[PDB]
């Protein structure tokens with residue numbers, strides 16, 4: 305994808321011979337572009353995940369967040385013809401590219417919020433929810449959904465968690481029972497406008513870049529590429545991506561909730577669904593892991609993640625879905 309990034313440079317005012325540094329951000333290939341003093345960020349979208357109008361819809365939310373919310377987000381750099389999404393075609397399908405202004409914290413080594421910063425993540429998430437709830441979306445807005453069907457049902461976007469390495473007979477029993485309880489809890493919770501709407505859907509600590517390691521600093525939310533319709537509190541599950549099994553989960557939750565409630569109400573019935581959303585994220589990430597596992601080395605990691613998913617499932621089942629610790 306480096307050659308795609310180079311092709312894309314010709315569409316921007318930054319020199320075509322600018323240096324490119326691959327950054328450790330996003331499932332897409334994202335590069336720090338350096339042209340003498342100038343720094344900027346080039347995102348090369350992976351193949352087949354979005355159509356261009358969907359990317360344009362993400363960028364429309366970013367534009368509204370920039371002007372109408374207190375959340376700091378990326379600023380798009382238009383191409384030389386004014387367009388926001390550059391599509392480039394090599395031989396052997398076309399690839400979409402978006403160019404952003406430099407973000408504090410993106411220069412290697414990339415600096416983001418840490419495990420000490422769940423509260424700040426919660427507060428920023430509440431601000432994203434508040435904006436989403438009041439924003440009148442453009443005509444023609446289009447983004448995909450993180451509903452049951454597209455997570456765990458008939459059209460799973462990251463594949464089946466059942467197919468991951470390490471997910472055998474005993475694990476599939478535990479995980480299916482907990483999944484089915486989660487499904488029933490989600491059906492009861494419903495998808496009314498107070499509970500479901502436009503979300504970032506990847507609000508991991510690593511996606512909030514900072515210009516300082518000490519609080520009171522500029523925090524930029526990056527990587528809106530999974531944004532779409534889903535449960536608002538699924539964003540909390542994403543906050544603990546890959547770390548759901550840590551014994552500190554309860555402390556992290558309390559910190560995140562304190563930050564969230566500083567900006568937006570978090571009612572008891574929503575707080576009571578936070579473990580469900582953690583478990584939803586866990587199954588999704590187990591599916592993602594399985595989709596990208598096909599070796600002995602990858603298998604050991606999937607095996608261990610599957611085992612921690614089962615420990616969480618047992619806690620979920622024994623508490624009737626109310627607790628993971």
Ligand code: NA
Nearest residue numbers: 330331506527
């Ligand atoms: Na992502």
Ligand code: NA
Nearest residue numbers: 466467471472
């Ligand atoms: Na299996």
